[PDB]
Design a protein around this ligand. Structure first.
Ligand SMILES: Nc1ncnc2c1ncn2[C@@H]1O[C@H](COP(=O)(O)OP(=O)(O)O)[C@@H](O)[C@H]1O
Ligand SMILES: Nc1ncnc2c1ncn2[C@@H]1O[C@H](COP(=O)(O)OP(=O)(O)O)[C@@H](O)[C@H]1O
Ligand SMILES: Nc1ncnc2c1ncn2[C@@H]1O[C@H](COP(=O)(O)OP(=O)(O)O)[C@@H](O)[C@H]1O
Ligand SMILES: Cc1ncc(C[n+]2csc(CCOP(=O)(O)OP(=O)(O)O)c2C)c(N)n1
Ligand SMILES: Cc1ncc(C[n+]2csc(CCOP(=O)(O)OP(=O)(O)O)c2C)c(N)n1
Ligand SMILES: Cc1ncc(C[n+]2csc(CCOP(=O)(O)OP(=O)(O)O)c2C)c(N)n1
Ligand SMILES: [Cl-]
Ligand SMILES: [Cl-]
Ligand SMILES: [Mg+2]
Ligand SMILES: [Mg+2]
Ligand SMILES: [Mg+2]
Lengths: 538, 538, 539
């Protein structure tokens, strides 16, 4: 028994079956011990992507993802994923090797107080003091990351413990089911009365709801009482985007005109403009597991402190108790004229003359037609970029829960390939399509070798406008000192990157090439990159 | 006048001429304001590389490099380069946009306390409170980064200031020459007397000595009195690797046998094994600008608190005053049998059977022959990896000061392309060769597009053994759960990445093809990638 | 046969530590007792605030780190006040904190706190002893770092499992190492000399970095050979006497504004100098400091002299001697005489103010100065703390010797009064320590009178009592409790009677005659004396 194998056995007793990371001094022994215990190891090319993958994996699987890094710069690179998981409220454990304990203060190799470096990004950050305490620290990180509001944790394994030996196996952690809570009956009763008296109720469904896996309870409630709902971006698909009660296509109007809003796992942070655009007379019912979230940015009527799935059901039962036959389809019907105006605005983009290239909307509309016909809603989507991501949110539909990851609460670029790895590993029998802007893609592009090596046959679609929001179409005549900050190199051949990893690449300039390229990606055993050149202009 | 242009005018008045970064919300207007003031902007593909480039550029240029990032995850990604510059003692300024000030606490877009996030990685971290204080904060970061022991600083620009306008130009910073200091005369005289009584003195020359640009003084001293010297890795070349007084080829014996060691800008940290292998009877003279560095890890005899170049010259004048002539060539000559024994050990690697692929030594010995014939030492070298870096240090020689950058005090992977950009921008008339392991390369490989776009014709040599220290030559038959953590995909075709950016790539498997490929890189107007497949075994 | 306690103690003793301030508990009492067994005196205080304040002041006074010892958790948190103080003042000290058992971290251990992190932003070095063999390295690093360069506080963490661990092998103990200093570059030095050579109105601004570095003899030689006007900051008062013929302190504002050259000697252009904002932009500034990050930040300077203050003064002096010109800048001091007289007339207006029937601040402190002047002729030790009390003490109570004055300093912190007095009395057992404090200031640390009585430190405490913070009420009996003003304390609180709690002597004083009589009884008393001086309560 070594520090490595006790760490590995502790993770194994808690059900960990895949770890992302990059090895070296001193943690290669830790990774090989985990593999020796039957835990798969996904070696990445940058710890940014490894720690993004771990966080997304935790969100998808409702249990902590695990990331493993070397000391010093390994952990510092992974702070990007700690910050990401903390913002997204996603469970994960970052395990970092650290320098020899008795060399701290001497300028040890990759010396860093890594517990302190991670403390403000995590719900728990701690160091294994000795071999006997390894299970305790691992278990504490595991339990804490998944409890209450989920988030990341940090576990430090100093070099002198990794290679330390013992003959006595410390008591290993045993699984513990996360206890949850329910709203107080008084609050739940008041919220039920608010809904009963409402004329225009609106369920706002966030990624806390999809994480908690409330899709069945939400569907039963929405469909029995015709309750309009509106998903946040990663909640798209919890019910299909084309569901008859989905108000997503009239988002701004539905929010302004609703007289009751039920927030289901969604915060009134920047994504909801802090609640500033809500009618002050709207009554707000907030369902969250973090009680510190209630009545901060915006006055709310009722805070329902409880688990989303059971809370939906309790509200649904409350409405059934009266025996009355509530229906709010009228509110959804009232949003129909605004939905048709928004559709008419989209059509103007779709019929714009070719430049001779397509614009964002024309390219992504073709993608949606192709993907819809091939998969009928059953695949996995990763979405990242600026204009590429917003247009993908409008045009590329979701039909199942937790089949969509995007830049999230941070609006972080660089999650594309890590999230796609996590998605493919969670759904080995499904196709994973990652739709990325050309700028976004360059943050994590080298993980295509990780995907190829780990037999993850990703489909990568790059919407390429030669820069950030827009670009130049010729830089050879621009004096280098005056090269604008937003442009990338015109017609960068991201498609040819696929050949470095024995994949397949396609350069696409028109809808015919786009359709034909995508048809060749559906059954390819490897990485496909579709590099779609679009109009560079703003 | 905006926050953006007051920032840009402040940097320009302090002589800033190039900035690395990535733009977005809310920092696009800042980069464009810098460009309008005549400051060149290098848009990168990940903030890791941009912040590594700024720190390298500061070291090479003896004034702070500048890195610009967006709020939240932009700054967090750049903490890797802060940590790196702090560890290397390199001057730089990280300029981060941040969220609207009156939205802190509300879950603003990319909300992060960025002053605090950067506080422990920097000599100064501060926020611009209003338009009037921007020059003060910029000037403070600039002066602090380069004073004393150099290091990184952080300047926060909130989004409400970036967009703020005024008609009053604040007083702009004026350049100020960094004050140096000299050792106390009593300590200097004691150090001179120690050297006069020495029989086997050794000058240990670190990258503080190259940063302070002491090559002229060092040469004069070494050659007049025949004083053996030993460079640390990035000090290689301060005098040529084949200089007749260079003890680098008998490094452990020279350190073991010296009766006096003069530490010139080098720490007794992990790179010197904390001084643990030095003879306890060896007298130690330590020249540093950081007095907190003296007499911590190892008992020393004299701390010379002073600027390295002037201190070398004062020691030299002190020896020259005595009239009695000094020559320590005998010490160097005593090292020759060990130099020879080390060359014969190297020769066993160079003549080892081919697999049919070369080993690290055979590949890099060929690279050195080709580079030496072409440039006669006059080029720029970046070196990154584990075995690849160690063998490059042994075999690829340096002949001029500050023409070599490697993984440094952190042993950090991922600095390769960022260091190459800074080196090429500092020496536009020289060739930049980056010798990277295959694992190392994957951390920063997408910056080849930055190099192509900004007209930086890098020559990239990848020493490819299919993984980290070693790899497998076949993963097709390995069950995915048992894939080892150290391996990468066999024969990943990094050479083909060059085609994505209209460069040129070469797959190379023997010394003949390596020489032929390298000869085609010397005058190519673009990025060249030579992918050298070597034996995968450990 | 050695323990963590004794390896720590022997490590401190080999580095010359001879006194430690602190408060013991679990398990650090074994550490203090091992220190006492090695010949190190332990000063047990009543609050860690005062202990850490005392350690920092002791460091300043003695030009070597003071040492503070506390228990885990709230012991260390209480001492962060003194770390912040020593950091702001640039004073060398080591805080030594016990911490919880290492293998209980994360479990909710008794007084569990990441104390290394807690102290990190307040210290130059914060570290933990990982095992018995590394105690000397950590202690030595804290000791060397605190005194090198710009001095400052450090933190050493001693976990409970280490305090109690035993070994039969003695680790190598630290050996003393003389702090290396630097000298300014010759180019900068020659440029500074040439600036001074061409000056008509030069001014040496002498700060507490100058007094810490002990440059009084070099400064005196330069000032007196060439008649160079100078101006001390509050704790530099006395480096040359307040009544030295070249002292411009009585015309501070005019001298600063009219100088054509300012030499800053261990003084910063921080809030205490209004950030340089009142200086004439045409004035040339020469800044002598050991922290190069200080140059050209708040204010444009001409020359940064990166070097040790005493040698740098001497090198400037020698540079002026080299020409053979008989430089004399007494004329600039003489130009300040109208302003000095105007300020003295302003003060005399306060001294002749009618009694109310109580004295005002100026009258009480002028009487104090008359008594102290007749009793000591300048040779005593002064601690000064308060708001108005402190400002009037600075104007009226004179200093005549270097490092004989401590006040609220860079933090303007209330609560240093008795800890500083303890350090001053321990540093000068052959001198009398007078602490002049406002009534509000005194209440922060007053219980340390028992520490002084217990440790045979015969402090003389003078409280200038106006019933509150800057001002007070003279009656609160008829004020409804909800409406009691925030600035007032209880009228005529009998701080003098506190002296009886520790077998000292106290005096209630309401006029200058009683003040004189009471003070005269304080100079030869074996114990603590407190003079409670009731003054006018109005603003
Ligand atoms: N099981 C659960 N029950 C209730 N609320 C939860 C649960 N898990 C997470 N949450 C909450 O869901 C919220 C997620 O909000 P956010 O990440 O802003 O979603 P979105 O970005 O989709 O609006 C967090 O406030 C979190 O506390
Ligand atoms: N101008 C200078 N004069 C003296 N010392 C310097 C100067 N600039 C930097 N230094 C010192 O040089 C040292 C660099 O050492 P280190 O980075 O460990 O070098 P290496 O890795 O080459 O051994 C630091 O201690 C730093 O304080
Ligand atoms: N030996 C020394 N040589 C030169 N400067 C020093 C020395 N010791 C301390 N200093 C400097 O003295 C200055 C003290 O300034 P400060 O505390 O503001 O003084 P004051 O409050 O009296 O104005 C600090 O900047 C510190 O770096
Ligand atoms: C880590 C990080 N760095 C920088 C940014 C700023 N940013 C926001 S979107 C974006 C890229 C936008 O370009 P692209 O992905 O090509 O999309 P487009 O809008 O051109 O379709 C960038 C760099 C960010 N959000 N995160
Ligand atoms: C940021 C970071 N992550 C991980 C490591 C661990 N590490 C050390 S060397 C190395 C790469 C070794 O492989 P390669 O560059 O191919 O060199 P080889 O030894 O195979 O020649 C890695 C990942 C590191 N030093 N820094
Ligand atoms: C630790 C701390 N708490 C509070 C303050 C605020 N403060 C400044 S001066 C002062 C006391 C002023 O009253 P006193 O000491 O009686 O003097 P007076 O001006 O009334 O003569 C206080 C509380 C401080 N400086 N430090
Ligand atoms: Cl745009
Ligand atoms: Cl190996
Ligand atoms: Mg784009
Ligand atoms: Mg390799
Ligand atoms: Mg008062």
């Amino acid at each position: 028994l070594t520090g490595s194998s006790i760490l590995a056995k502790s993770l194994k007793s808690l059900g960990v079956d895949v770890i992302f990371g990059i090895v070296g001094v001193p943690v290669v022994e830790v990774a090989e011990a985990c593999i020796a215990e039957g835990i798969r190891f996904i070696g990445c090319r940058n710890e940014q992507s490894a720690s993004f993958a771990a966080g997304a994996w935790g969100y998808l699987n409702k249990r902590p993802g695990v990331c493993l890094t070397v000391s010093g710069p390994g952990v510092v690179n992974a702070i990007s994923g700690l910050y990401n998981a903390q913002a997204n409220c996603w469970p994960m454990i970052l395990i970092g090797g650290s320098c020899e304990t008795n060399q701290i203060g001497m300028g040890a190799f990759q010396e860093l107080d890594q517990v302190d470096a991670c403390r403000n990004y995590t719900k728990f950050s701690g160091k294994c003091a000795d071999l006997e305490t390894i299970p305790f620290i691992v278990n504490k990180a595991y339990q804490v990351s998944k409890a209450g509001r989920p988030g990341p944790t940090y576990v430090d394994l100093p070099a002198d413990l990794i290679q330390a030996t013992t003959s006595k196996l410390p008591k290993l952690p045993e699984p513990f089911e996360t206890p949850y809570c329910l709203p107080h009956t008084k609050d739940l009763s008041a919220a039920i009365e608010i809904l009963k008296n409402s004329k225009r109720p609106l369920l706002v469904v966030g990624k806390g709801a999809t994480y908690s896996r409330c899709e069945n309870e939400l569907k039963a409630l929405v469909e029995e009482f015709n309750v309009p709902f509106l998903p946040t971006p990663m909640a798209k698909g919890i019910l299909p985007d084309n569901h008859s009660l989905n108000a997503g296509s009239a988002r701004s109007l539905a929010l302004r005109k609703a007289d009751v809003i039920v927030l289901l796992g969604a915060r009134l942070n920047w994504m909801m403009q802090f609640g500033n655009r809500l009618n002050p007379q709207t009554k707000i019912i907030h369902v969250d597991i973090s009680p510190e979230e209630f009545n901060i940015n915006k006055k709310i009527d009722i805070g329902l402190f409880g688990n989303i799935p059971e809370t939906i059901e309790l509200i649904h039962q409350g409405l059934k108790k009266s025996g009355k036959s509530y229906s709010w389809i009228h509110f959804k019907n009232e949003l129909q004229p605004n939905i048709e105006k928004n559709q008419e605005k989209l059509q103007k983009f779709l019929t714009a003359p070719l430049s001779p290239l397509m614009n964002h909307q024309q390219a992504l509309n073709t993608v949606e037609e192709v993907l819809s016909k091939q998969f009928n809603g059953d695949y996995f989507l990763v979405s990242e970029g600026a204009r590429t991501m917003d247009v993908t949110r409008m045009l590329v539909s979701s039909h199942l829960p937790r089949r969509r990851l995007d830049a999230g609460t941070l609006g972080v670029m660089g999650i594309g390939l890590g999230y796609a790895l996590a998605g493919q590993l969670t759904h080995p029998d499904k196709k994973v399509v990652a739709i990325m802007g050309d700028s976004a893609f360059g943050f994590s592009a080298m993980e295509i070798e990780t995907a190829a090596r780990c037999k993850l046959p990703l489909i990568i679609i790059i919407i390429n406008n030669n820069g950030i929001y827009h670009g130049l179409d010729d830089i050879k005549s621009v004096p280098s000192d005056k090269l604008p900050s937003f442009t990338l190199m015109p017609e960068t051949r991201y498609d040819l990157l696929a050949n470095s990893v024995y994949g397949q690449g396609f350069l696409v300039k028109d809808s015919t090439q786009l359709q034909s390229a995508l048809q060749k990606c559906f059954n390819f055993d490897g990485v496909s990159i579709v590099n779609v050149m679009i109009d560079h202009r703003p």
